[PDB]
Enzyme design. Sequence first.
Site, PDB file in Angstrom:
ATOM      1  N   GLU A 386      38.124  39.760  45.207  1.00  0.00           N
ATOM      2  CA  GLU A 386      39.096  39.746  46.313  1.00  0.00           C
ATOM      3  C   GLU A 386      40.491  39.364  45.874  1.00  0.00           C
ATOM      4  O   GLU A 386      41.204  38.648  46.580  1.00  0.00           O
ATOM      5  CB  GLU A 386      38.620  38.837  47.448  1.00  0.00           C
ATOM      6  CG  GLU A 386      37.268  39.241  48.003  1.00  0.00           C
ATOM      7  CD  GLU A 386      36.931  38.572  49.317  1.00  0.00           C
ATOM      8  OE1 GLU A 386      37.197  37.361  49.447  1.00  0.00           O
ATOM      9  OE2 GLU A 386      36.365  39.241  50.199  1.00  0.00           O
ATOM     10  N   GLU A 463      29.715  42.304  48.285  1.00  0.00           N
ATOM     11  CA  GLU A 463      29.670  41.105  49.121  1.00  0.00           C
ATOM     12  C   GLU A 463      29.477  41.537  50.568  1.00  0.00           C
ATOM     13  O   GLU A 463      30.367  42.159  51.135  1.00  0.00           O
ATOM     14  CB  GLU A 463      30.950  40.275  48.944  1.00  0.00           C
ATOM     15  CG  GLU A 463      30.746  38.789  49.157  1.00  0.00           C
ATOM     16  CD  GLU A 463      32.016  37.985  48.965  1.00  0.00           C
ATOM     17  OE1 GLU A 463      32.486  37.875  47.829  1.00  0.00           O
ATOM     18  OE2 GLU A 463      32.540  37.458  49.954  1.00  0.00           O
TER      19      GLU A 463
END
Length: 756
Positions: A386, A463
């Site tokens: 991220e 994720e």
Amino acid sequence: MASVTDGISFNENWRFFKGEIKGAEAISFDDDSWRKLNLPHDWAIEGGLPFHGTGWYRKTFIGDAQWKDKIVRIGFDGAMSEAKVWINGVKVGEHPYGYTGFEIDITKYLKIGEENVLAVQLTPRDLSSRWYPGAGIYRNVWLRVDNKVYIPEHGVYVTTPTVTKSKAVVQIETTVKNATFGNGKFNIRHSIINAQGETVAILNDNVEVAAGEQGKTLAYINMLNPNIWGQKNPYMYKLKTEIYDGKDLTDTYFTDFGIRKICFTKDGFFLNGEKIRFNGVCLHHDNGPMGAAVNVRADERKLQIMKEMGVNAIRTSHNPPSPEFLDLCDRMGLVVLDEAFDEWTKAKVDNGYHLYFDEWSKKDLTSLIMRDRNHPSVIMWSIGNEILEQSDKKKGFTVAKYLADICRELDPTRPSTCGFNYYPAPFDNNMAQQVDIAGMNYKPGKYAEVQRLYPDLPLYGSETSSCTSSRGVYHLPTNQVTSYDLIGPKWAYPPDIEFHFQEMNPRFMGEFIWTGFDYLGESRSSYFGAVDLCGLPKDRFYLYQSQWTDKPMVHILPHWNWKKGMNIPVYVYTNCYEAELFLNGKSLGKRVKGRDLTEIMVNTFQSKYRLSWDVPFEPGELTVKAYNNLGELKAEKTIRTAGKPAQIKLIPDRKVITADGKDLSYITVRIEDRDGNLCPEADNLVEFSVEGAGHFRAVGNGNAATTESFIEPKRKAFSGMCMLIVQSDENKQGKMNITATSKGLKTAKTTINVEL
């Protein structure tokens, strides 16, 4: 001699002080008042929870005569964080990143016969981690005494470039350091040792190394009818590598390894020639009550619980794990995404890795791959998660490439990957193309589109879900979250949505859920885990198990202590064809999976992954029967209305533990009524005594919103249960007697035997 020894523990007999004291680096510094302890040690588990400040460690030791004219190094597998290290007052080491290990050569400064002092200062900063890092020398420390011709750190690299049922080829690169004043040719003997300890193959090699230099050499050996490493049969070999200067053995160095092939295309991932799919989980490195200090059994338990859920794969969110954790994955047949960083040059937290990325990125990623490139469990190098560079349109991709090139330079035998949460930025900004395999964080609704737009990218859900719940808590209809599994953050969605979009996009290799276990934060703990912080499954565990395992099962929620008058929605999870619900004997009807859909509230989704009834609550018993398509009974569960809390039951996971000082028994603690039924909401304070062959270690209950100490011999139940953790003493055999006591309930006892 030093020739026989690979590396011995240096964990014993340290002094610790939490706080700043000047002059603690020096040989002559009074530390008689400093607490005495053995490593590994996480002072932050007290000792979200406070993880910053200053910690000092000191160890004093006689320079053994057997170290005279030897190379001596102290290997640290992990120190959290911002470490400085001294030997005899001389600063010989500085290491910021807490998740990569480091070595210090103390040879030049070592005094034989007289005293020596090893000092370590950690200065972990606030706002340097988005999850609980722990704080201290949380991983093992090692002493390495070597002769002047030897294998340096991470000096053996084992690959298997052919793997077939009839024959595997094991290719081995050996690195040898020559610390003498003379050029030499040195012989290398590779012994490959099987699971019974018998040497089955030997490979000879050699290497010329000049004085003061390092040399590398490559050889290969055939293994006929190899024991293939696989998920059902995770067979491990051991490599004994011996170095020789003529007739004299100068060094021995061990390396565990497996024999399996891996391969990927745009259409999926392959293990030993077969389509493999990732029923995956992200895990953080803490073990809850046990903190971040490395405990092999703590990890083993967590990975076992995950395997029972149907898990075949792990993402090391969002950092390197301990070697011990990877050894376990190796021995347990789990495939691993081994992740190096959480941020690169752009900051997510004020004091995160971006402070060190420029000077340290290459060192730390190099160190990770050098440490882990022999583990058969590891199948991908994940370069980041991220990362903010995703939105730098012009140049973000350069940093991804840079890390990706490093992976390929050091270990082309495994693909690179990265976890992407922006969409479409990293795919449109040439970033996702710089790694071998692209992972999407929380974008099931975009899986179809990204394959239209970028059809040559290999893909998986790096994720997923981020659904939250508290164990055994239901809100009809707060400070905790409903275990009906609907609520989460803005990007979150229930597991049903991932399953649906996985079945619609078969090219996706799989998912890695956020998270498998709950983890510690900065409400101090998480709600995202399918299993809670102390290792007790939430209902979500069973939802996953219904999707990911063949062994027939069925699970019913909620509990059955409600008030007369209420309509209770009852959910059933099963891998069977259909299920039938029974209240006190009365059939409330059949329900077929993939037909009688359950309306989940996210707009609302018709889910085929749950079976549901609306039940008017009459107290007594509620029983669910799961059947296959012929109507044969394949599983059943029965829940019942419990009365007033009357008695404590104790259930050790293991009644025999090893007498090594480290091994644990996790004793589930149940609050039961007069007839033995779990009181599904009980919160009774339970006190604990441990006498005999061992001691009280820790305690926990999976409540994220509590403030209770993990390390006091007292704990309250949460949703009927809590967990008591006990530990052997080193070399102390015999019985260890547990007594569990609570105001107004029947006292409970159990014995843990301790052997070896």
